[PDB]
Amino acid sequence: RRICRCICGRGICRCICG
Prior knowledge:
Blueprint: E1 7-8, E2 13-14
Antiparallel strand pairs: 1-2
């Protein structure tokens, strides 16, 4: 939608964009 807080690295990864 407009807010995006995707974080990913050497193990953890979660995209919160919309």
